Amino acid sequence: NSDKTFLENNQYTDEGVKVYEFIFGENYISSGGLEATKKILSDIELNENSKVLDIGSGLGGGCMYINEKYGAHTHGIDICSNIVNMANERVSGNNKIIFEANDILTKEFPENNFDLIYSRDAILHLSLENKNKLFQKCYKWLKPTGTLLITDYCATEKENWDDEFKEYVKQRKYTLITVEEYADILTACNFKNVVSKDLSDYWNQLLEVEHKYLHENKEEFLKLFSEKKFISLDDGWSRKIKDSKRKMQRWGYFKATKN
Ligand SMILES: C[S@@+](CC[C@H](N)C(=O)[O-])C[C@H]1O[C@@H](n2cnc3c(N)ncnc32)[C@H](O)[C@@H]1O
């Protein structure tokens, strides 16, 4: 009843994680790395007394940035123990950053605890039933004055997927839904002021920067990895660029409040 072994042994092996970090940037394994993070948080207000939860915290770049910018207490949860071990090696002497290995679906936190619950491209791993269960937990865990802030991989309606896109989703065991279905889940969970944005155009821009970087730094990549891994990454980004342009694969942004 867990995907922990599946994730640790395939997509998020140590080397898999290091390949992602090469292309996304130091401390990041998701879209746009540091630059997208600055943008996503540009209108967010927190301070040194704030409490933040990062769901699917990865190598911890997001927690590092939120703590640096605001001085906030940050608690990241990630199901992959090897990734959490790597995250903890990236931070020292800071008792306001915590990284914990756990399945968010089984983790308990106090009701009315967090000023911000933040997640970047992680919830795509959860089944539709579990997305709904997670957002019910998030609603409970947010302070009355708290905010939910998410980016996640979305898609056009499943009926519209082509062969290559179906294979991509199946191989990774992603559950991708439309930006609109996702927003409706938040509304159903009683979140208020639900804002969704289809950021597929911006995502396409981020992908192009990354793809260019990969090509310009191929020699360095090959010193670290193998040509086989290069080709896989290169082809993967090419498909994401193509599919984001036509909105077959989409990038969703969601912000909501508890009250
Ligand atoms: C995009 S990657 C990490 C993203 C990270 N926020 C970043 O921007 O670099 C997705 C992460 O979600 C985590 N994840 C998947 N299912 C999870 C679950 N059920 N509970 C906690 N973390 C999970 C994976 O371990 C993985 O590190």
Swiss-Prot record:
Give details on activation and inhibition: Inhibited by phosphocholine. Inhibited by hexadecylphosphocholine (miltefosine). Inhibited by S-adenosyl-l-homocysteine. Weakly inhibited in vitro by amodiaquine, chloroquine and primaquine. Inhibited by NSC-158011.
What effect is documented for mutating residue 125 to A/Q/N?
Answer: Abolishes activity
Write one Gene Ontology MF term.
phosphoethanolamine N-methyltransferase activity
- Induction data: Transcription is down-regulated by choline. Proteasomal degradation is promoted by choline.
**What CDD domains does this protein map onto?**
AdoMet_MTases
Highest taxon above the source species: Eukaryota
Known catalysed reaction(s)? Answer: phosphoethanolamine + S-adenosyl-L-methionine = N-methylethanolamine phosphate + S-adenosyl-L-homocysteine + H(+); N-methylethanolamine phosphate + S-adenosyl-L-methionine = N,N-dimethylethanolamine phosphate + S-adenosyl-L-homocysteine + H(+); N,N-dimethylethanolamine phosphate + S-adenosyl-L-methionine = phosphocholine + S-adenosyl-L-homocysteine + H(+)
Q: Which membrane topology describes this protein? A: Peripheral membrane protein
UniProt-listed GO biological process terms: methylation; phosphatidylcholine biosynthetic process
Biological pathway: Phospholipid metabolism; phosphatidylcholine biosynthesis; phosphocholine from phosphoethanolamine
How does inactivating the gene affect the organism?
Lack of phosphoethanolamine N-methyltransferase activity and disruption of phosphocholine synthesis from phosphoethanolamine. Growth and morphological defects in trophozoites and schizonts. Lower levels of parasitemia in the intraerythrocytic culture. Reduced number of nuclei in the majority of schizonts. Reduced viability of intraerythrocytic parasites. Reduced gametocyte production. Defects in gametocyte maturation resulting in the absence of stage-IV and -V gametocytes. Lack of oocyst development in mosquitoes.
Record annotation: effect of changing residue 172 to A: Abolishes activity
Enumerate the UniProt keywords alphabetically: Cytoplasm, Golgi apparatus, Lipid biosynthesis, Lipid metabolism, Membrane, Methyltransferase, Phospholipid biosynthesis, Phospholipid metabolism, S-adenosyl-L-methionine, Transferase
Outcome of mutating residue 54 to A: Reduces activity. No significant effects on protein folding
Q: Gene3D superfamilies under this entry?
A: Vaccinia Virus protein VP39
Residue positions binding S-adenosyl-L-methionine: 29-30, 56, 78-79, 103-104, 120
Outcome (variant: residue 11 to N): Reduces activity
Where, in this chain's numbering, is phosphoethanolamine bound?
11, 20, 153, 168, 172, 174, 240
Q: Name one GO cellular component term.
A: Golgi membrane
Q: Per UniProt, what does mutating residue 78 to A/N do?
A: Abolishes activity
What does the subunit section of this Swiss-Prot or TrEMBL entry state? Monomer.
Quote the function comment for this protein. Answer: Catalyzes N-methylation of phosphoethanolamine, phosphomonomethylethanolamine and phosphodimethylethanolamine, the three methylation steps required to convert phosphoethanolamine to phosphocholine. Has no ethanolamine- or phosphatidylethanolamine-N-methyltransferase activity. Required for gametocyte development, maturation and transmission to mosquitoes and for oocyst formation in the mosquito midgut.
Protein name, please?
Answer: Phosphoethanolamine N-methyltransferase
**Organism this protein belongs to:** Plasmodium falciparum (isolate 3D7)
